[PDB]
Design a protein around this ligand. Structure first.
Ligand SMILES: CCc1nnc2cccc(Cl)n12
Length: 209
């Protein structure tokens, strides 16, 4: 059972701007997704200090980066707090509306797309490099879900029957044909070192087989 939803108009407008604007410094998408994973890990770590059973779904707090050239995907996995169905359908977009308005105003005043994370909407930078984004996520208080969007105004949400993940989020970036440099080990290593060198969780870059 797949449910289809319309983005709010303002979020659709943000996604079109990210897809259509000429902007060569695309590599910042990875910093933004790693930052979001770090924030999700911070959140489960803090909650676990008052309820240690919140880690019954997995004690390890980490970020994995997994390129797959055969599927042309780059997957960012974290064992953070995860997202509920309400987060995926309503809550994240509600918060993103105000950050989007502020980001758009900043761009008109001279900011550039690399500053997107200062407005809280860095997730959508994934569309600098991905034609489709699939998010598999599991929060302790809800079931495992898959969110997916190729932009164009709509997204889907379904219960996920694939390999259970325990807790956290996997962001699967289906890369555009001209963005396969982000599958190369040396390129991902360069980007992590430049923009994510002080993240407080282990980041493992998997190697392709
Ligand atoms: C990683 C998933 C995610 N993070 N931020 C947002 C905003 C809207 C929709 C989704 Cl799936 N998001």
């Amino acid at each position: 059972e797949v449910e289809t939803f319309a983005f709010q108009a303002e979020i659709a407008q943000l996604m079109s701007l990210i897809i259509n604007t000429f902007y060569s410094n695309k590599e910042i998408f990875l910093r933004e997704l790693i930052s979001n994973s770090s924030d999700a890990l911070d959140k489960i770590r803090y909650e676990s200090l008052t309820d240690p059973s919140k880690l019954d779904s997995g004690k390890e707090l980490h970020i994995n980066l997994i390129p797959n050239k055969q599927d042309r995907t780059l997957t960012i996995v974290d064992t953070g707090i995860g997202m509920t169905k309400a987060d995926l359908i309503n809550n994240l977009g509600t918060i993103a509306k105000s950050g989007t308005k502020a980001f758009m105003e900043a761009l008109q005043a001279g900011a550039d797309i690399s500053m997107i994370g200062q407005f809280g909407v860095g997730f959508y930078s994934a569309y600098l490099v991905a034609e489709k984004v699939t998010v598999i996520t599991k929060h302790n208080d809800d079931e495992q879900y898959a969110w997916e969007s190729s932009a164009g105004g709509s997204f889907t949400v379904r219960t996920d029957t694939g390999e259970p993940m325990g807790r956290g989020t996997k962001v699967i970036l289906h890369l555009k044909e001209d963005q396969t440099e982000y599958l190369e080990e040396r390129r991902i290593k360069e980007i992590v070192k430049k923009h994510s060198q002080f993240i407080g969780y282990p980041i493992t870059l998997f190697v392709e087989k």
